[model samples]
Target chain A: PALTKSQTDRLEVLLNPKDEISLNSGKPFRELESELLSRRKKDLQQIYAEERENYLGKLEREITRFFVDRGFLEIKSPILIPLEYIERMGIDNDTELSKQIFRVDKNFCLRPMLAPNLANYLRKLDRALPDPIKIFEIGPCYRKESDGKEHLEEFTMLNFCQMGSGCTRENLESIITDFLNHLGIDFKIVGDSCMVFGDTLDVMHGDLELSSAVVGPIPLDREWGIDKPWIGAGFGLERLLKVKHDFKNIKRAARSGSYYNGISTNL
Target chain B: PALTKSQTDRLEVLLNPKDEISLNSGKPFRELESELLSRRKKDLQQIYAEERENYLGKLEREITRFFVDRGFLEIKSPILIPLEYIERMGIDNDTELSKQIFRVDKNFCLRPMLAPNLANYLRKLDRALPDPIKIFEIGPCYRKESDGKEHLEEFTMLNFCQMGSGCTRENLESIITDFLNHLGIDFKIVGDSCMVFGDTLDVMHGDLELSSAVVGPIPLDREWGIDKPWIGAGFGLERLLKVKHDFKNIKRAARSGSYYNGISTNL
Candidate 1:
């Protein structure tokens, strides 16, 4: 981890901001220096870029190992898909899922969840795949939950799906809890009773409820409140990382890391 | 993980159906079985109220060990966000990401990537904090790519970020390469130039000159191009894993595993 001479020079200019060193700039580099230093560290200006990357790198290695040990295979899926699958899912053409979906000449749906895509894969797996499949995926799933705490239009999730008949609701919960606890932590059950919106998923997920049990809130006869049956036992990874180390703040933590620092200022 | 006698009986009934069972009505279990088993794995004939609770004792240990070994302090972040960021990013209201962009009081975007959310966290840590933040985020980044290789709309991504002044491009490459090597595999680097779609991108990048740079005979340059860069280097995980196992088809690698069999079918 030795920095070469060139890297050292670059560090000096970036670390201790004196003046905008752009010889070709009309604005004096010195004039911008004070403003640069004065930039509120509370938002984006306080921490150094290099530190951000370092934190990311460490986190990456740990996650890779986490999946490796769980009999989970690491991999990537495609960003484009075919029309047939989209039709099968029964989504409208005017939906947001369709809009943000990056497509080629062949129309495709940018997958929102691993279930359908996984289902597609499992269907084709036929007899080759052994029974009782335990599948896990680490990638992005897009949705349109603009206000919900657990909503992300396009966000990364770690999914563990066991494909055998033996997989039940309880098994799923235990697996998730155990994994989180193994990280030396605990989680809340949050709430059950999902609120099913009519056009809500029409904008995110196109039609025919993505899955069979992918139902919404249930109106209980005995209770007056709505119950969300599909509870999301999820957490924000970055937040979790910060709280774990008892880091003073995200700004300081981001800058002290190696990986986040790697992205060139030019990008 | 012992099943109660009643649960065991239910499991048996679920696995092996007969003409009649103690829990059915006039149609008889045989009629139900015929209709249910004939359609895919189960016909949704009768709801199995039975569930199982597993003690993910061992698996949890593995995940914890994975992160702790690399020095990651797990944290969490807010899924709901103000819409200003998305607007700044110029997401059309009709896009899929935009769909889940919930805004009750103020518009907010569900996190699409851990780094950005982590960025906010880093800024919070700008002052009082430790050096070299090694943060890992194992969460969902959503996308809607369907009908392609192994993919899911909501998939998990193991992302790590750090910061340091001397972080160089080479450093990033070395980290990625070494990370893959740790898993005993080699990954191929796909340069932007080799993709053969530079012209299309150049157009999107607003570089009209790139229109000529593209080499397709009947170039649909004007029709299919961006005005700027959207994505960076992407290493398909499935492909990378396949390369590790020396398997040519990612489908083979995905389906052959005890956990990833469904991904294989998706392709």
Candidate 2:
């Protein structure tokens, strides 16, 4: 090993804050710390004395109101969900996404996505409600995902779904278009073979996937007794902020990060 | 230390998730782990198979709507604030609550309260908006405060204030009562000599402090060129949830905790 355990710990925050620091590094801890701190100092200096309001939180409030305007009830789904819910979302021990799960106990884990819980609520709401039960949830989610510019250890998700009769795929597309238009951003929707759901309508900003929209009546619906046509889209709020702001790291837009708004907070 | 480093780490999660793990403990790691795991098993068993909703997120939405309904624009202030803003709140190196400041750098720190930033924004918004600029920020805030059941390292805050003409102390009480009534929580307002704000009106849930209300035109206003009388109230969302649900630890209600919507996520 090139770096000691303590040196590795020091680099953990300096590099990608979420990442497990690679122990194979050449420089001594002092130089490595100094080099990172120097960069941090430069980053901090770039920000002006004028305090910037949080755009991530603003985006959340804006998106929430969009759903609210359309008579959608904001459902604040739990981030900590049962392990059974994940399994219900076509994710089992053998599935690919199961590896990314941050399992806390045998029966519980931090939710990687909002679909499972929303799908669960949809079944219950269906029994009592009239046509088109529109609901949304925007909150934090966790995943032991790979180190990527788009991926975050913990991120904000905006999951909105409407279950009703006469709801077509075109309706879903309209919702996405209207939403992106509401956010005042240019985006295109493309069809992709998706996991969990059979197929997904993905909202893209050039190279980034802002949201993954899907229509239900799939096999997974049978477990929840869901019988009607449904339209659901789960958007990564961080990625939306990232694309809008052209941020280098997604953490600046993420809920769990050292950066506030766009300013650096490295000590 | 009564427990080994490994045992301490495990207990750190098992016990108060945010608290510094008390090394003084009894039994081996496996046994201690089992004791806590037993509680988790019981907690898991307590929850019905049907998934419940997240009340914390709901309260957030409802409170946001209350402000919005009253013509207050929700401004999501930064959780990461400049060190100068903290000092602007009449806090310095020798202040009583200064020890609770989570300073990330020489200039930047996690905001313990929303008043300083709100005051800053009030000045900026005043220069632009005509008449009354009723603005509010409902977002996460951090404090390195005490480990009491009432305190949380990270918590949600709803800080709403109006910087306009003819704002009396009675109107400030009206705002507090109206807001609490909107929350549907039974609380009372009382006068107190505060540490940060002079002659504060505290919102109480028996002994727990839900919010601290203050009327401005104080000495702090001179710095921001704020001469007009303003009404401000900073409410702790976690404490509100705790009072409503009667949860034991405020961490169960705090933003930075293992629990979600009053349910434990203990491993």
Candidate 3:
């Protein structure tokens, strides 16, 4: 029902004004919350679940099979660490991360990446033995990201690193590309994008609204060169998955590995 | 061959000197760096693959099933959020989080939790013809974490929230107890571990070594108690799942739906 002007004013006082501003900005924060209550909400759950199982399940199987077929050892790292260490890493004492890190003690912090653990493991190997170690980490990485459709402070990261002789950076990149291709994804090495980081920043910057032309491969501030062995090529799984599946919205993109995909979209 | 005395002296001169201050404190920095290399030198690629499959791949399934069975709707929110919104929420701008949060045009932040997005959903409902909401979110949450056995800057989280009438804090607590039981976990809430931000701060400050505790009611600091009547609960699924299966380490705890319990135990 439409509210009386007086009612609107009164209710406005009670409702969080920022909520109103979000509404004005066309961010459907309120509507989506309501959907959390709707009858279709159950269906949404079902759909999401089915998809997650089907898509991620298959991906897991094949991916794992690939690794297991080629001798690999898995390691689990703790999510929390000592605060003193973060200081050593030179993380600012006053950023959102310092606060967002789940601290159980002055010494502990929640993990932001799995590399530290993988790196830790790598450091522990006996020096007298073997060369060319290949390892991959697939796990959740936490972030203090602000929420949106293709953003979660948390998500899964699949990191594969090759150590030892004969494993050039190009070889690793080719491995990733080949893996995606095996999954029937038409992924190509589109080259590095100008921006990099977690997802929430992209949404807040309002870059999500731009067209593909503007979005993909923004001019790199640094050109590729012979000597600069920088972070080679990067791919955002969400964006890649979305592009492969022809998803229209970022929300649909997330459903790629959602359970609903399994139940509804049988592979 | 091992180094002779003169060789050791030469090694020291090359890698370090008597007056050369080291960045690392406990062990020789070269040893530490070398350990990292040695561990990864042999089959580093193997570890990466296994980590992805054993830890992350299997985890995705278990979590998906647990929530789907509970009639909880799964939602994916963006990891990026508005910096202005974070600032407005009274976040201090000069913390370790600054570097962890990768900025794109100075507008967004990496999402830290799912609650804010849930909050957005609640606002969208506008409180018209409502039922309580049960939502579960699983994703990677990033942080500026230091390297350690338990702390990674990037890790995963499984969080669920129940909104609406009859969703009392007691119910939330019971839900935790029930879920633990369902997971076949033996745990206790311990002391005043109820949801309260102030209380969480008290625990961290009071218990200097909260991480050393085997089990207890640990409250996440930020989402401790944002609003009255809003019940939230999150657990590191990795640990919780490990406990259920009696796995000594998290590395092997992940079990795909197909990895029958019996088979898992034998392996």
Candidate 4:
């Protein structure tokens, strides 16, 4: 379709033209790009991404089933919460964690994690229900994460926590082991510490830390009138999938504008 | 925390205060709202929303399985798609549906429906696969919908379509009937017409149109290099749940900043 030029900066425009560069040629670069786009799109018709997407879907279903079968009540809470909940989770306005929050208004913000709701609701459940209160929430969480090689602005979290007179660190480790085993994901447990709940068992998949489990009768427990021991674990779903499937990019396993499953959408 | 105020717009502020009127009394209204908010939050601690969400989870699982068992390959395409896909779906720049689209950029948009992906992918599948090629996608769709009693800006859609030599109107009805029956949802079919496909059979849940099934060997087929009979249908997952659970607000069945599974977040 080019009228004359075989040796212009048209290829540079197609590749990478940085800063300010003026090019008067429209049909050549655009037509080449459109052709490139068609070829890229033609590959999508092969259903390449379907395999990866299905694996993620299977992970979600199996994860839910894993907990539900263990009598964990799957709670679908509001992703939006009042700022007070974050404060009660020990994230003060002065803290650096508070800066990562995505505030919706003067009163509310998108939940950074599912733990706050479970922690706040723990005492009430303890009162009404019997011992061994088991609950979990698997849903979208929002944070203005400063980096993204292993994080996303919006990520899915599977937060599972239980409370009773009998919850201990040993059972917490056992539970996390069984949970990961049920998913057939190989992992190692490393000793760790958390800001909100000090001292932890972190489930690691190679260099990536997948889940953090905390056993606590910490001072923060009495805030909700809970004075007893509890077991809590939170898993970043994208990271879990990324390692299991080796997506190589977290964005590939996330709700993305640029990539569909693992395929790049660039022209 | 309330100092003292027998009667004031404090109640109006808690209930409904309109326009702009200035009054300086912080503790009274603030204390009342906090109390009201506490009581509302207490109800959530009961895990009341669990049943409804579990039903939604079941619907998704069963719906996907239903098609998968029937040889329909489940496709999870990107929620974000290029604008050319929409134009190929026959949504011109001047159309009302075009206005509703949430454009991400000059070239990209959040998909308003999954059928475009299916329709575009249909021809390719036709070339590679056998006759009676079937596929389905169940995922989120976005539109800046103009109304909300029965709509959401971001809603989940289950779109399933197939192309084959034997596809017919009777089979379309049979497929839709079986699909609804599998979910145990009682529905009636009514004769209908579509903008893109002239005649259709609409799947109805009372007054609500749950899905539109088009059996088309229409003019649009050739654009993707097809001249064969096809059966395509799309379902709004939120509306489906709303009716199944009698969710009074569609927002209850959707992702919301204001409501969580039929519970309001207002203080």
In the range A66-155, model 1's lDDT, one tens digit per residue, is 655664433344433455555444444666554444332345444555544544333333333445443344444444544332233444
Model 2 chain B weakest 10-residue run by lDDT: B44-53
* Most accurate candidate by lDDT: 2
Q: Candidate 2 residues B1-267, lDDT tens each?
A: 267787776665555332333346555677767766665545433332223334666677678777767777556555555788777778867857888776643576667887777776667555435557677777766666767688866678889898897467888888888888877899888888776778888888898888888888788789766878898889988888887776767766754324545544534
Q: Once model 3 is optimally superposed onto the true structure by TM-score, how far is the C-alpha of residue B10 displaced, in angstroms?
A: 24
lDDT of 4 by residue, A169-198 (tens): 888888888988877789999999866777
Over B1-267, each residue of candidate 4 has an lDDT whose tens digit, in order, gives 443354343333232212232233454555555654455455444543344235456678888888877767666656657878777877777867878876643566667888767776566555545577787888777776778688887778898887886588787778888988887788998888866666878889998889988878888787767678888888998888888767656777775434444444343
Clashes of 4: 0
DockQ of each: 0.05, 0.05, 0.07, 0.10
**TM-score of every model?**
0.37, 0.53, 0.46, 0.63
Candidate 3 segments exceeding 4 Å error: A1-131, A138-159, A164-178, A187-234, A248-267, B1-61, B83-112, B122-132, B139-156, B165-171, B182-184, B190-230, B237-267
Model 4 alpha-carbon drift over 4 Å, by segment: A1-53, A78-112, A116-128, A140-155, A191-200, A216-230, A245-267, B1-53, B78-112, B116-133, B141-149, B152-155, B163-168, B191-200, B215-230, B242-267
Q: Once model 1 is optimally superposed onto the true structure by TM-score, how far is the C-alpha of residue A56 displaced, in angstroms? A: 6.2
Write down the DockQ of candidate 4: 0.10
Query: How far is A186's C-alpha from truth in model 3 (Å)?
Result: 3.8
* lDDT of candidate 2 at residue B4, scale 0 to 100: 72
